[PDB]
Ligand SMILES: CNCc1ccc2c(c1)C[C@H](CNC(=N)N)[C@H]2NC(=O)C(=O)Nc1ccc(Cl)c(F)c1
Ligand SMILES: *[C@@H]1O[C@H](CO)[C@@H](O)[C@H](O)[C@H]1NC(C)=O
Ligand SMILES: *[C@@H]1O[C@H](CO)[C@@H](O)[C@H](O)[C@H]1NC(C)=O
Ligand SMILES: *[C@@H]1O[C@H](CO)[C@@H](O)[C@H](O)[C@H]1NC(C)=O
């Protein structure tokens with residue numbers, strides 16, 4: 277309804293690029309935020325039409341434009357060239373704050389699915405701290421659902437609408453390029469993953485009750501969405517997930533169908549230089565990988581799925597607004 281500002285806890289002395297951007301763009305955080313419960317009120321939220329998502333999107337586009345400059349950007353006919361130094365890159369949390377005369381309403385119901393009426397509501401200055409993590413298929417380093425796995429969608433009957441799964445337990449994923457120059461791998465403990473897809477299948481079954489629930493790899497698209505792609509210490513990883521989204525939930529029981537070894541799923545990854553941009557239709561070209569060992573140890577805290585007698589879910593992504601949405605779902609700006 278108005279333009280928000282960000283608060284962050286960044287230092288002017290990190291050269292980490294999120295810190296630099298935030299010290300230019302954000303104000304410091306309140307050491308004690310105010311919060312005002314109101315359990316009588318009941319208000320309506322819709323995470324799928326939330327202008328906070330559009331402001332955060334614009335901010336993160338700006339952050340990446342100033343921080344992860346490509347050697348070459350191809351958009352349409354033009355090709356822009358610029359210095360593309362290797363940088364230190366590690367996302368920091370950002371708070372979105374209502375300016376004077378406005379408030380942010382926060383839905384306090386643990387099981388709120390992001391849409392409709394919410395009975396227990398608070399008013400706050402700023403959202404919690406949100407790390408702006410760009411990725412497909414898996415949502416990394418978010419905040420977990422407080423109680424049970426929530427399944428969010430603008431419309432579950434529309435198979436074209438992205439499904440956001442909000443986990444209540446995180447699943448570790450460790451991706452490393454060890455000391456090919458391009459070749460890397462991710463390790464996931466097949467047991468944790470096993471359990472969580474068992475519970476995700478339960479929830480999806482509540483919403484599609486006659487049907488068998490199948491997880492399969494992504495069908496088609498650019499590599500950015502047919503693999504789990506993400507940025508790690510400035511390098512763009514593309515990790516094959518066909519051993520991950522590969523399993524059947526039949527009779528209240530989940531069977532995993534992808535290959536593991538020693539109780540570990542290992543995704544084969546590549547570090548790429550030519551990127552299909554998430555910000556706009558275009559390609560961006562980066563320099564070859566820095567040397568040493570490139571490792572990110574992340575929490576999987578959610579999934580992005582697409583639905584195709586049986587219901588079949590494949591990993592999705594590509595619109596980073598769904599990533600922001602997964603964190604901003606409980607917030608509205610009012611007044
Ligand atoms: C489900 N269908 C909707 C859908 C599908 C795919 C995409 C969109 C929407 C928007 C976006 C358009 N851009 C383009 N065509 N060049 C395109 N997404 C991307 O290219 C994208 O995320 N790349 C990417 C790059 C780097 C990293 Cl680390 C990353 F995690 C992702
Ligand atoms: C979310 O909850 C609303 C009611 O609050 C319901 O109408 C809608 O179908 C639900 N959506 C999902 C994906 O559960
Ligand atoms: C998480 O939610 C699932 C399904 O919604 C539930 O079965 C499970 O007990 C919950 N686990 C924890 C640790 O809260
Ligand atoms: C969402 O699903 C279908 C679209 O295929 C349509 O009935 C309408 O757009 C929505 N229906 C419900 C029940 O929300």
Ligand SMILES: *[C@@H]1O[C@H](CO)[C@@H](O)[C@H](O)[C@H]1NC(C)=O
Nearest residue numbers: 499502503516517518519544
């Ligand atoms: C992932 O790996 C499988 C087998 O290793 C292969 O068939 C598939 O095409 C790969 N997908 C991508 C996007 O590389």
Ligand SMILES: *[C@@H]1O[C@H](CO)[C@@H](O)[C@H](O)[C@H]1NC(C)=O
Nearest residue numbers: 492493518519522533534535
């Ligand atoms: C599941 O993994 C196996 C190998 O681990 C592969 O042969 C199979 O194609 C995968 N399932 C699907 C549906 O792709």
Ligand SMILES: *[C@@H]1O[C@H](CO)[C@@H](O)[C@H](O)[C@H]1NC(C)=O
Nearest residue numbers: 466467470530531532536539
């Ligand atoms: C879950 O993963 C563990 C580790 O490999 C395995 O022993 C267990 O049988 C799996 N459960 C399944 C596939 O349902």
Ligand SMILES: *[C@@H]1O[C@H](CO)[C@@H](O)[C@H](O)[C@H]1NC(C)=O
Nearest residue numbers: 416417506507572573574575
């Ligand atoms: C997730 O957070 C950890 C701890 O801050 C960090 O090391 C890791 O690189 C993060 N993952 C991504 C993809 O940013």
